[PDB]
Design a protein around this ligand. Structure first.
Ligand SMILES: CCCCCCCC/C=C\CCCCCCCC(=O)OC[C@H](COP(=O)(O)OCC[N+](C)(C)C)OC(=O)CCCCCCC/C=C\CCCCCCCC
Ligand SMILES: CCCCCCCC/C=C\CCCCCCCC(=O)OC[C@H](COP(=O)(O)OCC[N+](C)(C)C)OC(=O)CCCCCCC/C=C\CCCCCCCC
Ligand SMILES: CCCCCCCC/C=C\CCCCCCCC(=O)OC[C@H](COP(=O)(O)OCC[N+](C)(C)C)OC(=O)CCCCCCC/C=C\CCCCCCCC
Ligand SMILES: CCCCCCCC/C=C\CCCCCCCC(=O)OC[C@H](COP(=O)(O)OCC[N+](C)(C)C)OC(=O)CCCCCCC/C=C\CCCCCCCC
Ligand SMILES: CCCCCCCC/C=C\CCCCCCCC(=O)OC[C@H](COP(=O)(O)OCC[N+](C)(C)C)OC(=O)CCCCCCC/C=C\CCCCCCCC
Ligand SMILES: CCCCCCCC/C=C\CCCCCCCC(=O)OC[C@H](COP(=O)(O)OCC[N+](C)(C)C)OC(=O)CCCCCCC/C=C\CCCCCCCC
Ligand SMILES: Nc1ncnc2c1ncn2[C@@H]1O[C@@H]2COP(=O)(O)O[C@H]2[C@H]1O
Ligand SMILES: Nc1ncnc2c1ncn2[C@@H]1O[C@@H]2COP(=O)(O)O[C@H]2[C@H]1O
Ligand SMILES: Nc1ncnc2c1ncn2[C@@H]1O[C@@H]2COP(=O)(O)O[C@H]2[C@H]1O
Ligand SMILES: Nc1ncnc2c1ncn2[C@@H]1O[C@@H]2COP(=O)(O)O[C@H]2[C@H]1O
Lengths: 404, 404, 404, 404
């Protein structure tokens, strides 16, 4: 995309400006050798004036009140080539400090980088990364200020920049070795305000990290606290340790399969067409694999499909017993069950991976002809008899059909 | 408002007192030149005694137990002109330390500033701002204490105040360069307690910042974790990547339109009259634009209106197909649909921006005469047939009407 | 209570031990003058062995497995008078370091102080207070260790204790001036481990403060984010600014009255008898103030009472209009309404503070005889006609009564 | 388990490598004496190449794309014996820095330790422990780097290692005494990057601690905020202080018994078979202790069992009064009730620990023959008459039975 590469170029240009403008403010001799870049950057600095208005016009233009509002005002203020003229005129420090207006583009750059990276990047991590980048740029600018308040000396420019950056990293990280310290009162005022800013931004870093790690394992923490709540309630209820262990291993299966998410709660997040499609292709060819739903309209299939209730049967659990009066049918999704007798010694069948059981109770109220026992965790779907008749009432033709 | 400007004046007076009272405690020669201000401030310091009781009387007076309770007791304690008399008498330091009772008005000032700014300002940000202001005032007071425990010298007052403020900012920000350090045991005790206080208040700043940034993007984080939960569940269910992409782009549309908020959940927050008005002017002239709801009572219109179910149909999704038995009507809110044949090759019509489809199924149970396909995201509202008859039962006159 | 004062005495004794045992470990000459206290404390140190087992026996004794388990094991280990014998024998430092076993009672003291103060004190604030007290005791112990690793000198004991406490407060608060620093390798190892411990406990303080302030305004933050969600949804729905302002002021009223809590959600937290009593005395003599519910059984009154639905009508809102078919009755709780004509020019009546309207629709289906308009926020309760007949079905005698 | 002990051995080997590789990088003379260990470790470093692929094959093998993907790539990169060859060749520092590739196994070790300890250990605490271990290893490596940038001297290796570790603990904990400080520009660059890393990881520690303590008392905080919400709502409703105290003590009982968890909300977390088993053995032999449910099928017992509604009756509360028409039966779970007359002076009976009352209303609509008053908190279960007939409709045989 041309918009993405243009935004990357604008970000690189603004990073170059943030690095250079204080650096050339304290080193005016650096202004001339990098003059061919600046004008190009300055061209970009005005080339982004319409293009941004163009790039927001393609994405739901609506209203674009430029030259006003909290948005696009710092962009236009930084867009004007103040830096070139002030560095050409070689104005004194109180007036040449206005060259930092060029750095006001950084807030718009951060907003644009948020907009182009709010999808594949966590907003907490994106905010932390933007804060860290702004902190590095601010550390460079603060080191440049420390240059500008250092006494003049014949120290090499690299060595004194290293010392200034070392001081501002000691200050900003709240470490403060104190080997290099303020000497003049103006340096002391500057160190006070830089200390306040560094404490503020280090608290910002710590808070952003705390926010990032507070929901780093939100699903696992939610599932574990649900398990703890259930276990505490059962221990209060004097539940036998065998059933507690069965519930614990069920929750372990739930966590290891679907991250402990309840299927019903996840499905209500979807709208009706998306829920319909999800539940149709969850039971894709599975629901129309049974005979009673054959030769039926796809509308009646979907009326079954939205009314299927998921239910997890742990290993060794009776789904339906023989002689039970029975009021439901079950469609195995990914588990496995065994159909046995009422005595559960002779295994009639083994059903897994999309087959079903209990359809006799769907067309008569006679008790179950056989017992169904869960071999392992089943993840099968239960359709109630009463819901089946409730949806059968408004399809009369298949209501007449299912007598056969 | 007179109350707001009076509270601003009281806040300014208390800030002046917080700046000056320790400053004139360590500089008694400052007491005389600022005497005309103090009495005026002292007048304000008693002028706020009834007016606050007046200003809380206008806002649900109820009970106003002054001269007692945790509220209004520090206000009255700071209201008395202790500072003027103690600075006039020039009492020694252990007894003149009681002039800080004037600064006890700061808690009431913070409470009042909270009350007048709990609407347009986030409570976390308001608490952080109050904490930062109190930290600056405490830093000034601690620097004044550092003056009061420094050995006497002919150093200029400004320079030594700068040194003291520099020390207390090193201490409070937990930086601690150590260039200036305790020398006397009393200074060491003072530095210990100031270090504990500064660590406490810096932890307060970091905690407030962490709280502020933990819910800085609460809507985006909630929507993203909902999307992650749905995507993880679908990937467990072996959902095809085409449907996963469709659900992802649906959630992107939901986030970019209504911040990922489910319409039903938002509407249950409103009470019945406000929900009625919201759903009436959401479908403003839209619901009475259809023929079957014409010449009807506005009560029956509102009975439709509260029972409309929102539903989002993604682009290329079938709302209703031709030959489907059909049990609902749809009112397009802001999307666009196309009415096509059962073969979906001949386009019958294009419907968008407030028009509707599917009204035949509202007065007969015959199948749909045409297929409706979503051009883009629809945001339309679905009214069920069964709900329509449920509300039609108790309006017999329009029940007789709608046969035509 | 004897238990509370005994626990306070035990806490004071353990604080005395935590202050003294390292202090007398580095100052053996302090052991003899405070000998009469120690034995008394030692007596308390064994007097708490049965009494705690007694004090937990009064509060649901159940099982009390002493001399084992993570509970009551540190209590018994600290209970034995190791300190007295080791300070009597004057054993060398590696063996006399075992006198700190007496300080193991601090975890049991913290647990007991939690149990006796988990009701009127926030658990986050209680945890933070316990952490701060333990940090102060640990700072004293660490300063004593710093004494024990300082080179011997004729410095006064108070001055060197002040220096040691100053060092451990610099270390624990992560300030670190560096004016006093390790000199010997053993001091350097000690400073490394103390730095790790101080960073750990300062992170603990910051985390506890962050937890405390994350839910310091949980109700206000929840209400404000609900308001923001509703407002964002309505702005997406192009809701008119008049209705948005009405909803905003409704939410302001809700926050200023019931802290933004929905009445239904609060009532479901209560069990059936408590909900019954709450809703009975909310409408105390209010529900039996109307004529149709006179001479009725209190059981039928309570069947009305649990089925009353609260609803807030904002000022200037129509509750019921004249000519509306009407299916409910309303009991004003604390608001005020005006009964006017269909034209709403002639005011029939003003109803407030426990009276009612709309009872004709409770015994006939004829339309409303007059319009009811909300003067201000009403907080009235709505009883539906269908619910009224649903509960009237199983009281036949008053079903026969209400025809009159 | 062989897998667990092999993972422990791998963790120990990688900890040995993390301790030694920088230590022998700055002390080449240490490479030869520990050569027999390294090769053994190197053997383990390749012995984990198939075994991990084996150990993930036993646990739902599925796909194992080794030699690629973000997983198993650092494991294989660290698996190759780069360290042995580079320390044998004695290559210079820029090329011998590649021996740290062996330390890339630490991320896989952390992941494996997470997987083997995500069950009995809190994920927040596990993350914090892994972070602290990685911080200690990084502190050792950073101290080794500080050695490598220190000027050469005849200082003892232990003493200078102690000084380097002291410096990196001052830096990483953001304490920064400044007694030992950078001297050379390369040391200053190293200190800058180490300061940034130490601030980052100390913010990580503080954030992890904040996350750990934000949900350290999640149940207690949730219950307390629910109690505060209910109390604030009732105080708004002018609820009498007697009923407020009764609700407060009910919530205290709820917290002290089931941690304030609502029974219904906990039960919906369970699936249908687990909920069936839980509610069956909660009423184990309790539900079939009553006469009307005798000689009945176990299916009808379970149909009762899933439809039992828990309800807490506080002490002195009327469950059912004599003369009340009555529409439910109650099964006492662990509380105690007294059956008295309508005048409640003559005590008919005392029922507790699994017995029941109110069964007459289960087979007739005549009013209650006696009043039932709660002696203490009851925790009994309520079965409605309407639900009883609703489940009785589809068992005709016991529907005929219960007339007797
Ligand atoms: C985003 C990152 C932004 C960084 C820019 C701020 C630091 C720039 C310092 C330039 C100092 C300089 O080069 O000269 C400032 C002179 C001395 O004048 C002075 O008053 C001292 C001014 C000190 C810095 C004021 C910054 C105001 C914004
Ligand atoms: C994006 C583009 C960034 C361009 C940055 C500058 C590149 C040129 C550079 O770096 O040229 C060396 C600098 C500038 O001054 P000069 O030596 O040319 O002055 C003349 C020599 N004289 C003092 C003896 C008279 O000298 C120095 O110290 C500057 C050293 C580098 C400072 C920034 C390092 C990166 C910071 C990130 C945060
Ligand atoms: C809200 C911000 C409040 C700031 C006020 C606290 C700092 C005031 C220091 C005044 C010290 C002074 O000017 O003289 C205190 C003398 C020496 O006496 C002494 O004992 C030393 C007392 C040190 C400060 C005690 C503050 C007690 C509250
Ligand atoms: C709101 C109103 C605030 C008014 C603050 C005071 C204004 C007057 C001022 O500032 O007058 C200079 C001060 C006071 O002492 P002086 O020089 O008049 O004493 C006599 C000269 N002598 C020592 C040679 C004998 O001198 C100083 O150092 C004080 C410098 C300013 C200290 C506070 C700065 C703001 C802090 C915020 C937190
Ligand atoms: C809860 C608060 C608890 C505080 C107790 C810990 C500090 C006690 C220091 C006693 C040092 C002493 O008086 O002598 C320790 C000697 C030297 O011996 C040594 O090894 C140095 C031992 C340094 C402290 C080890 C604490 C172990 C627990
Ligand atoms: C997980 C914990 C990992 C720790 C490993 C990082 C520290 C290793 C330092 C080795 C320094 C050395 O022994 O020599 C590095 C030389 C000097 O060369 C140089 O450039 C300086 C390199 C400084 C450290 C760079 C680490 C890159 C990864
Ligand atoms: N021999 C069999 N082969 C396959 N399925 C069977 C067999 N016997 C029983 N079943 C299934 O097991 C179910 C048990 O309950 P139903 O008798 O309701 O319906 C039964 C059939 O779905
Ligand atoms: N020619 C048309 N012009 C406008 N709307 C149409 C036309 N044909 C069909 N429709 C609408 O498309 C709907 C499809 O479902 P129904 O047949 O229930 O009701 C149909 C009408 O609402
Ligand atoms: N004159 C009146 N005095 C008191 N209440 C009235 C009067 N006229 C009407 N109302 C009440 O206002 C209500 C409006 O709706 P209804 O007619 O259903 O029932 C009406 C009465 O409860
Ligand atoms: N004498 C008694 N012994 C035991 N239980 C009784 C006695 N009298 C009443 N009850 C129980 O108390 C209940 C009160 O309500 P019911 O009359 O519906 O049903 C009653 C019986 O369950």
């Amino acid at each position: 995309t041309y918009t993405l590469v243009w935004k990357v170029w604008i970000l690189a240009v603004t990073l170059y400006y943030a690095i250079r403008i204080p650096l050339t403010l304290v080193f005016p001799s650096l202004f001339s050798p990098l003059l061919p870049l600046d004008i190009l950057a300055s061209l970009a600095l005005i080339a982004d004036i319409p293009l941004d208005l163009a790039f927001e016009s393609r994405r739901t233009s609506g209203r674009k009140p430029t030259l006003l509002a909290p948005s696009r005002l710092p962009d236009l203020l930084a867009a004007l080539p103040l830096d070139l003229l002030v560095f050409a005129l070689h104005l004194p420090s109180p007036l040449s400090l206005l060259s930092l207006v060029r750095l006001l583009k950084l807030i718009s750059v951060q907003a644009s980088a948020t907009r182009i990276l709010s999808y594949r990047i966590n907003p907490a991590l994106l905010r932390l990364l933007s804060l860290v980048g702004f902190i590095l740029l601010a550390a460079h600018g603060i080191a440049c200020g420390w240059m500008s308040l250092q006494p003049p000396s014949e120290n090499p420019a690299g060595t004194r920049y290293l010392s200034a950056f070392y001081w501002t990293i000691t200050t900003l990280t709240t470490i403060g070795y104190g080997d290099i310290t303020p000497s003049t009162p103006t340096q002391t005022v500057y160190t006070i305000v830089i200390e306040l800013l560094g404490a503020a931004m280090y608290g910002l870093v710590i808070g952003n990290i705390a926010s990032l790690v507070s929901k780093l394992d939100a699903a696992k923490l939610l599932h574990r606290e649900r398990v703890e709540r259930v276990t505490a309630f059962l221990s209060y209820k004097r539940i036998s340790p065998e059933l507690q262990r069965r519930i614990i291993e069920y929750f372990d299966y739930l966590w290891e399969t679907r991250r402990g998410y309840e299927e019903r709660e996840v499905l209500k997040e979807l709208p009706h067409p998306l829920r319909l499609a999800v539940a149709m292709e969850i039971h894709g060819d599975v629901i129309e694999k049974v005979p009673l739903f054959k030769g039926a309209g796809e509308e009646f299939i979907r009326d079954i499909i939205l009314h299927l209730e998921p239910v997890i049967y742990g290993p060794g659990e009776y789904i339906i017993r023989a002689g039970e009066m029975g009021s439901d049918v079950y469609f195995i999704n990914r588990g496995s069950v065994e159909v046995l007798s009422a005595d559960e010694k002779t295994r009639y069948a083994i059903l897994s991976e999309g087959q079903f059981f209990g359809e006799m109770a769907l067309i008569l109220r006679a008790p179950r002809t056989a017992t169904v026992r869960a071999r392992a965790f089943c993840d099968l779907y239960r359709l109630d008899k009463e819901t089946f008749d409730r949806i059968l009432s408004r399809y009369p033709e298949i209501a007449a059909q299912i007598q056969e």
